[PDB]
Amino acid sequence: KGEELFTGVVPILVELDGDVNGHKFSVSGEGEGDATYGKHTLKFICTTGKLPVPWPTLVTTLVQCFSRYPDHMKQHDFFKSAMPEGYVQERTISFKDDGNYKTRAEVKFEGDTLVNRIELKGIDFKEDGNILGHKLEYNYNSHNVYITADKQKNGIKANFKIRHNIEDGSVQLADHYQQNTPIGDGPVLLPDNHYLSTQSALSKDPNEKRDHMVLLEFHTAAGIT
Ligand SMILES: [Mg+2]
């Protein structure tokens, strides 16, 4: 069963190819996760130069299999149950009064490493909106990711609203619609409605001159007693 693959520390690789309003970029990440504690740590580098969008707008795209599912909820952990063959994770991220990201990712094991490979496409961004104008603060709020089963697709859906702080004290909403479907043909766990409680801390490596993001993430399943 997939959950057995997560009882210890697992190395993580993340690779993203993006195009936002014609601005092409790539991000590479490395770190590790320990789902026992709902915890993952990564450092991401923009390998093409300067990132053309704010780092916070990429956090959700850049491994929910590292969520801590409490023992009494283990039967609701789709994410691990699809491993090692993995899952496709797709989103539409709608930035209020601005453009949208469409993302397609494959999350799977490559040997003993958990890999998140992503294509991101962003369109219809305003040239001096909060995203292409870089008006988002380098910080991140705590959210609830609401998950529901999609039995027709043998997977799940999720819906949630990310709140991005703007440098003038306002908030940029980013509505997330998500679908995950298994890559393999083995059975998966189809959960009851629940949510993941998320927390994120963004920082910088004081010795790093490349455009980059250091991330500490907690994800904890909740909403079933
Ligand atoms: Mg503020």
Side-chain angles (χ1 to χ4, degrees):
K1 74 252 255 110
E3 91 212 319
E4 320 188 351
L5 301 175
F6 291 90
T7 57
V9 179
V10 179
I12 308 163
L13 303 175
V14 182
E15 292 293 333
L16 176 152
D17 277 349
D19 175 332
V20 175
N21 279 35
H23 297 282
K24 300 185 186 290
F25 64 95
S26 306
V27 173
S28 293
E30 305 176 28
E32 63 176 34
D34 191 12
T36 298
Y37 311 101
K39 184 186 185 179
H40 38 306
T41 54
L42 297 129
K43 173 183 177 182
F44 301 96
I45 302 160
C46 182
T47 59
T48 52
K50 305 265 221 149
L51 196 71
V53 293
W55 279 110
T57 66
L58 298 186
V59 164
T60 55
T61 298
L62 295 168
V63 292
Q64 296 176 308
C65 47
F66 288 104
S67 300
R68 188 179 69 80
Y69 275 73
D71 183 83
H72 75 273
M73 290 186 64
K74 70 176 100 56
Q75 66 269 45
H76 303 288
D77 187 349
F78 162 87
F79 303 100
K80 295 182 189 56
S81 83
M83 300 293 164
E85 299 76 10
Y87 55 76
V88 178
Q89 178 163 303
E90 294 172 281
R91 301 212 179 89
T92 299
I93 302 170
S94 301
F95 294 88
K96 177 178 168 162
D97 294 342
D98 212 334
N100 62 88
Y101 295 166
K102 288 193 170 286
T103 65
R104 186 182 187 281
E106 297 193 357
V107 183
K108 68 189 68 104
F109 279 85
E110 298 293 340
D112 298 319
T113 297
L114 192 285
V115 174
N116 183 20
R117 276 187 74 150
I118 311 130
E119 297 164 288
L120 179 151
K121 187 66 177 296
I123 66 172
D124 283 313
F125 285 92
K126 296 172 177 177
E127 278 165 38
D128 214 40
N130 292 319
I131 293 79
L132 296 174
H134 293 271
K135 309 185 189 184
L136 302 184
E137 299 181 339
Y138 192 72
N139 55 36
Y140 214 88
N141 291 299
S142 300
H143 304 99
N144 296 325
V145 171
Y146 300 96
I147 298 173
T148 54
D150 180 355
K151 303 184 157 253
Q152 98 206 311
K153 300 244 238 217
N154 197 38
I156 59 170
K157 299 175 162 141
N159 286 273
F160 53 105
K161 293 178 174 263
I162 297 298
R163 285 71 164 189
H164 294 297
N165 298 160
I166 306 166
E167 67 192 355
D168 69 350
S170 194
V171 175
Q172 171 70 65
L173 171 62
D175 281 298
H176 283 57
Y177 178 58
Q178 174 178 341
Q179 221 260 299
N180 298 54
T181 52
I183 295 173
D185 55 37
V188 293
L189 301 173
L190 301 177
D192 293 343
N193 296 356
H194 67 285
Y195 61 95
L196 308 175
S197 172
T198 65
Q199 303 175 340
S200 307
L202 315 192
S203 61
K204 295 297 183 181
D205 174 357
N207 294 128
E208 180 58 72
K209 297 180 178 143
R210 292 168 295 177
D211 204 355
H212 74 282
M213 174 174 68
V214 180
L215 178 66
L216 167 63
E217 189 59 43
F218 289 96
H219 284 203
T220 309
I224 301 173
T225 53

